[PDB]
Write an enzyme that holds these catalytic residues in place. Structure first.
Site, PDB file in Angstrom:
ATOM      1  N   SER A  76       0.842  -1.194   0.000  1.00  9.45           N
ATOM      2  CA  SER A  76       0.000   0.000   0.000  1.00  9.45           C
ATOM      3  C   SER A  76       0.881   1.249   0.000  1.00  9.45           C
ATOM      4  O   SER A  76       1.680   1.377  -0.935  1.00  9.45           O
ATOM      5  CB  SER A  76      -0.951  -0.127   1.217  1.00  9.45           C
ATOM      6  OG  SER A  76      -1.954   0.867   1.276  1.00  9.45           O
TER       7      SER A  76
ATOM      8  N   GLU B 225      -8.838  -3.681  -5.751  1.00  9.54           N
ATOM      9  CA  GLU B 225      -8.137  -2.687  -4.943  1.00  9.54           C
ATOM     10  C   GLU B 225      -9.034  -1.547  -4.448  1.00  9.54           C
ATOM     11  O   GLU B 225      -9.002  -1.186  -3.275  1.00  9.54           O
ATOM     12  CB  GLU B 225      -6.974  -2.046  -5.721  1.00  9.54           C
ATOM     13  CG  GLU B 225      -5.852  -2.968  -6.118  1.00  9.54           C
ATOM     14  CD  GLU B 225      -4.982  -3.516  -5.007  1.00  9.54           C
ATOM     15  OE1 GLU B 225      -5.343  -3.544  -3.838  1.00  9.54           O
ATOM     16  OE2 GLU B 225      -3.903  -3.954  -5.329  1.00  9.54           O
TER      17      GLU B 225
ATOM     18  N   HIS C 156      -8.051  -4.684  -1.108  1.00 13.37           N
ATOM     19  CA  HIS C 156      -6.771  -4.072  -0.792  1.00 13.37           C
ATOM     20  C   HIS C 156      -6.351  -4.384   0.650  1.00 13.37           C
ATOM     21  O   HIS C 156      -7.146  -4.133   1.548  1.00 13.37           O
ATOM     22  CB  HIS C 156      -6.896  -2.564  -0.987  1.00 13.37           C
ATOM     23  CG  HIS C 156      -5.560  -1.837  -0.881  1.00 13.37           C
ATOM     24  ND1 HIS C 156      -4.633  -1.701  -1.819  1.00 13.37           N
ATOM     25  CD2 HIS C 156      -5.116  -1.187   0.242  1.00 13.37           C
ATOM     26  CE1 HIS C 156      -3.652  -1.004  -1.350  1.00 13.37           C
ATOM     27  NE2 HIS C 156      -3.965  -0.694  -0.120  1.00 13.37           N
TER      28      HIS C 156
END
Ligand SMILES: *[C@@H]1O[C@H](CO)[C@@H](O)[C@H](O)[C@H]1NC(C)=O
Ligand SMILES: *[C@@H]1O[C@H](CO)[C@@H](O)[C@H](O)[C@H]1NC(C)=O
Length: 534
Positions: free
Chosen positions: A209, A341, A449
């Site tokens: 991330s 995501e 995500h």
């Protein structure tokens, strides 16, 4: 109790945890407090000799994320987000937070010369600590496959404390303090990891991330010169969800705007020198003032208040331009994504239900996009609920009529088609890419995500083959394929190549596929990448 003598002669004690040995909480920079606020980190001058480093120090100061998700997610989806912990504020926190942690195989000692995996954490450049990412599953797996590694993780400053921008920061040359914290942590490893059993010429940096976007910034830093003392600071990089940051220069419209807002909120609105004023206010005033600028799970979502920006000095230009101009380190890379995501970020704009509302949401998140550009974007990602994310779930998961298209746009620009743009222009080294579909069918979020954090650090699933075994094989050998998996991982040359170029993960195992989905989105988004910067 394990010991190690640093390069300067200080002998420190760590912890014997039976399955590994840990040196936790070592300071590597001077406390960035008072008039060191927002400035470049200064090397720790001070003796550590005789000290014990047996527990994680406090994280740096956290910004409250401001999400509403816990009331819109089904129990199954929510249980899994709770577990990765990437979207939460860590506690305890302090401005005196710049410590580094070394965790190694039991019995390791100076001269073992093991590969080093340097972990960079990252929730939205606004939250995170090293204490929430357990190294033990990665290390235990490395020992079991006969490819032992040392795990190093570094704290860095997040939010206003680490990524404040605007004209005054620029003038002072203090942009992107958080990335400079990480870089100094890398130098510390170059100079001291041999004393713990590591080899400084075998460092692989990896993160997930904002930590992955950080690995990309580190490849582009100083126009791709990653050497320190005539050697490279790292030989390979692994990027779990995050490529270039789509941001305007440090002194652009939003960097300035957030600075002015924070300075007013901290009680420095009438100062002639606002940085001097902000270094004067108390820790509480600064934290409260920061929490009055938007957090990443608020409606602004990925129009992030604090994030890496080009400064003309160390990140010299727009990161997409740097990648197509060849100004990057020449290293082997693994870069990949989770299939859905943007779904977690999509929970921030659940009051947008019509197309006109969606058009206004895109027009206010992307201030440089013309109407024509916004028109093309909404054609490439239509309202049609079968075409949004969670991908391929038909008419399911449509929390609102626009949830799935907003989630598809956020996922792609922020992470999934930004990776393809990098892979199509990077010629610095061998490229390997993966895409996980491990969690297909999980309601509302799909393979969301940060789920890879659970299978990398807590639990075993089909994904752990890539997140642990292939990544240890790549760190050791610079080829994932020495892990000895059932499926051979294809080298990636470009999205237009014939043949499968993606390692893929499903519920049962690994397989391969092609990076050729949503090419219309890729052209709407990246024909002119500046049009969609924040
Ligand atoms: C940033 O760039 C300048 C050269 O323009 C260099 O002197 C400085 O050391 C760099 N900073 C870091 C942290 O690499
Ligand atoms: C959604 O809510 C935010 C505040 O949370 C507001 O500023 C925004 O204008 C709203 N948009 C719509 C379409 O209701």
């Amino acid at each position: 109790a394990p010991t190690a003598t640093l390069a300067n002669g200080d002998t420190i004690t760590g912890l014997n945890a039976i399955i590994n040995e840990a040196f936790l909480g070592i300071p590597f920079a001077e406390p960035p407090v008072g008039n060191l606020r927002f400035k470049d980190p200064v090397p720790y001058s001070g003796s550590l000799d005789g000290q014990k480093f047996t527990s994680y120090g406090p994280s740096c100061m956290q910004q409250n994320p401001e999400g509403t998700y816990e009331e819109n997610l089904p129990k199954a989806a929510l249980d899994l987000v709770m577990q990765s912990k990437v979207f939460e504020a860590v506690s305890p926190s302090s401005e005196d937070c710049l410590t580094i942690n070394v965790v190694r195989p039991p019995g390791t000692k100076a001269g073992a010369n093991l590969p080093v995996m340097l972990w960079i954490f990252g929730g939205g450049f606004e939250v995170g600590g090293t204490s929430t990412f357990p190294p033990a599953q990665m290390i235990t797996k490395s020992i079991a496959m006969g490819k032992p590694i040392i795990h190093v993780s570094v704290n860095y400053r997040v939010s206003s404390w680490g990524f404040l921008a605007g004209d005054e920061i620029k003038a002072e040359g203090s942009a992107n303090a958080g990335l400079k914290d990480q870089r100094l942590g890398m130098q510390w490893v170059a100079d001291n990891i041999a004393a713990f059993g590591g080899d400084p010429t075998k460092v692989t940096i990896f993160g997930e991330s904002a930590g992955s976007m950080s690995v990309m910034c580190h490849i582009l830093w100083n126009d791709g010169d990653n050497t320190y003392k005539g050697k490279p600071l790292f030989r390979a990089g692994i990027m779990q969800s995050g490529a270039m940051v789509p941001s305007d220069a440090v002194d652009g419209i939003y960097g300035n705007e957030i600075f002015d807002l924070l300075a007013s909120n901290a009680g420095c609105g009438s100062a002639s020198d606002k940085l001097a004023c902000l270094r004067g206010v108390s820790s509480d005033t600064l934290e409260d003032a920061t929490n009055n600028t938007p957090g990443f799970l608020a409606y602004s979502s990925l129009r992030l208040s604090y994030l890496p920006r080009p400064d003309g000095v160390n990140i010299t230009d727009d990161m997409y331009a740097l990648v197509r101009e060849g100004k990057y380190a020449n290293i082997p890379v693994i870069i990949g994504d989770q299939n859905d995501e943007g779904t977690f970020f999509g929970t921030s704009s659940l009051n947008v239900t019509t197309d006109a509302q969606a058009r206004e949401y895109f027009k206010q998140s992307f201030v440089h996009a013309s109407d024509a550009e916004i028109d093309t974007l909404m054609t490439a990602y239509p309202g049609d609920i079968t075409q949004g994310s969670p991908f391929d779930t038909g008419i399911l998961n449509a929390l609102t009529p626009q949830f799935k298209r907003i989630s598809a746009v956020l996922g792609d620009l922020g992470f999934t088609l930004a990776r393809r743009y990098f892979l199509n222009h990077y010629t610095g080294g061998t490229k390997y890419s993966f895409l996980s579909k491990q969690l297909s069918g999980l309601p509302v979020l799909g393979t969301f995500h940060s789920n890879d954090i659970v299978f990398q650090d807590y639990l075993l699933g089909s994904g752990s083959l890539i997140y642990n075994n292939a990544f240890i094989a790549f760190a050791t050998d610079l080829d994932p394929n020495t892990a000895g998996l059932l499926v051979k991982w294809p080298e990636y040359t470009s999205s237009s190549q014939s043949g499968n170029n993606l390692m893929m993960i499903n519920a049962l195992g690994l397989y391969t596929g092609k990076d050729n989905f949503r090419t219309a989105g890729y052209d709407a988004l990246f024909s002119n990448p500046p049009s969609f910067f924040v």
